[PDB]
Design a protein around this ligand. Structure first.
Ligand SMILES: Nc1nc2c(ncn2[C@@H]2O[C@@H]3COP(=O)(O)O[C@H]4[C@@H](O)[C@H](n5cnc6c(=O)[nH]c(N)nc65)O[C@@H]4COP(=O)(O)O[C@H]3[C@H]2O)c(=O)[nH]1
Length: 253
């Protein structure tokens, strides 16, 4: 297990070098209104010796070695720079960015948001931050504090992998997100299954009057796209809309 630990060590070193040396980059997936906005989701990549590496390569090591906090700060800072450059170039771009629960209590994350929005002159509304519902359940106080701190900048905070149980309804009484992205477990077979269609309607019929935007992901076909619209979902993303890529060249309208 010396060879293995040496492998782990070199990934950790590489991730540290990527933070210092700009070795990460972002790719972007368009997010389309069903019920409009220039909106993309940021996805992280690592440029390691001619390969455009996915986080499937390294995130497990990052989490084991407590590097996720710093990686999410890197992504948010890079995202705000992108929003700033896009604005300067005449584009009203919005980005959806991932943060994990360790960021909820990280003063450097709030500092990064506050300071980088300001220096690029980007209104907070352009930045949407998403975290998995599962992590809010287990870090509720800190999540509420994060929500309050970043909503003071007009940023949107929402939940991904959102479920359809009564635990979710209870959470919404205590945590008011700007948006909800449905877990793929609910939406996978929306085109061919009635119980999925009903879970989605239970969520949209509550979300809509509460002013909470709803979102579906991994949309793979036209029948699925067509069915989210019926159920009242606000936004959709997936390879059938457009795949992740390096450029923001989607024509939204
Ligand atoms: N979410 C999502 N993904 C779609 C969709 N359509 C296609 N994809 C692709 O399918 C993969 C889904 O992985 P994930 O569950 O988002 O899981 C992600 C996530 O755990 C992590 N990840 C990716 N980007 C970030 C990031 O910016 N921050 C953090 N903290 N983790 C990230 O790496 C995993 C793999 O990401 P990728 O290699 O980029 O690969 C992504 C993405 O490129 C869609 O509608 N939604």
């Amino acid at each position: 297990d010396r060879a293995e630990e040496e492998r782990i060590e070199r990934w950790v070193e590489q991730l540290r070098e990527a933070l210092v040396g700009d070795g990460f980059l972002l790719h972007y997936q368009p997010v389309l209104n069903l019920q409009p906005l220039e909106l993309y989701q940021a996805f992280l990549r690592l440029e390691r010796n001619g390969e455009m590496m996915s986080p499937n390569a390294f995130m497990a090591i990052a989490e084991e070695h407590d590097l996720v906090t710093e990686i999410d700060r890197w992504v948010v800072a890079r995202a705000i720079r992108q929003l700033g450059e896009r604005q300067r170039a005449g584009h009203k771009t919005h980005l959806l960015v991932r943060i994990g629960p360790n960021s909820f209590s990280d003063p450097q994350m709030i500092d990064t948001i506050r300071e980088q929005l300001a220096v690029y002159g980007v209104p907070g509304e352009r930045l949407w931050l998403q975290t998995p519902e599962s992590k809010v359940f287990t870090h509720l106080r800190n999540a509420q504090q994060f929500l309050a701190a970043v909503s003071a900048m007009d940023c949107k905070v929402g939940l991904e992998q959102f479920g359809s149980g009564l635990d979710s309804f209870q959470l919404l009484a205590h945590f008011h997100p700007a948006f909800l992205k449905l877990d793929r477990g609910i939406t996978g077979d929306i085109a061919s299954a009635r119980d999925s269609q009903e879970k989605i309607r239970e969520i949209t019929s509550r979300a809509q009057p509460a002013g909470i935007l709803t979102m579906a992901e991994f949309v793979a076909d036209a029948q699925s796209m067509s069915s989210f619209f019926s159920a009242g979902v606000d936004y959709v993303q997936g390879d059938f809309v457009a795949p992740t890529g390096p450029l923001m060249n989607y024509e939204f309208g």
